[PDB]
Amino acid sequence: EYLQITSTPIVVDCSTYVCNGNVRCVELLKQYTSACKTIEDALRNSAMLESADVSEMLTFDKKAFTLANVSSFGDYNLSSVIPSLPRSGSRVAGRSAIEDILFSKLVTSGLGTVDADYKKCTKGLSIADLACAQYYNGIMVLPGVADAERMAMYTGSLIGGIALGGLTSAASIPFSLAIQSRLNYVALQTDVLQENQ
């Protein structure tokens, strides 16, 4: 099942988009007192609320993140969902073997909704990029809320939570006993050999 949790936020400067920076036009725009106020407030406030409640959902647990490993699941091969090692250091996580597929096998449709680089627009040597041209019109795309690093920390912690069993000193249980515990929640298990595992 797939559920969307965020949308790339876009903010627009009302004065630059309508007047192109012409000084005379800016004075005429003041007659439309509530026109720009409504447009800027709606885009700015919606983006801040979106980033506020997304950051509330992203919890982390260092204890559970350590258990996101193939050695913690036994016969259940979770290698396709655990995070990848930090290939270049300076970080604690990375994309799983399924996240990079969904993020790359899907079309690289960078036709405008790119949080492109702003520091090269005003001092660059080459003619302006398609993204810089939008920035000159006051349309600027903010960086995505769901950061790539926070995602791997968040998902890695949740996957590792399934290996926790409430043991003293945080010892990890065999994963065959985690499934048995969740089966007992359905109906009290009377089988002793546990061959059904």
Partner: protein, 148 residues
């Protein structure tokens, strides 16, 4: 343009209004076990007050502060042929000092083992407690062997 603004806001408020009714029915009137719906942790009760254009909720929840270690056992095996497990999966049998006690796994609520706390099963696991019917009274203080 004004109709577009009002219809957009009505759709947003209607979605939030339906969530408020669910929380009033499941968190304020009743007590919920749906994790995270009435705040994190174990829900006890909720309060509600008026607010500008809406409601404000005050979820009262319990958070743990200390933990107790217990030497827990998976079950019992009497004479090597009669196996027993706890009647409720949320209970745990543990050893304290020389005797035994039963406690819930959610809250530490000690309980004296009664024969009705167990369920008989066909086989015995190797991790079960070995005991005979002669000494079963050490685990269940009310057990009396009426045969013997």
């Amino acid at each position: 343009v004004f109709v577009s603004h009002t219809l957009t806001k009505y759709t947003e408020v209607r979605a939030s209004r339906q969530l408020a009714q669910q929380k009033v029915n499941e968190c304020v009137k009743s007590q919920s076990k749906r994790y995270g719906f009435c705040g994190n942790g174990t829900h006890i009760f909720s309060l509600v007050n008026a607010a500008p254009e809406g409601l404000v909720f005050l979820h009262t929840v319990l958070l743990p502060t200390q933990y107790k270690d217990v030497e827990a056992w998976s079950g019992l095996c009497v004479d090597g042929i009669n196996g027993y497990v706890l009647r409720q999966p949320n209970l745990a049998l543990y050893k304290e000092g020389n005797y035994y006690r039963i406690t819930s796994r959610i809250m530490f609520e000690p309980r004296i083992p009664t024969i009705a706390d167990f369920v008989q099963i066909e086989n015995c696991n190797v991790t079960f407690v070995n005991i005979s019917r002669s000494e079963l009274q050490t685990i269940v203080p009310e057990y009396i062997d009426v045969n013997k």
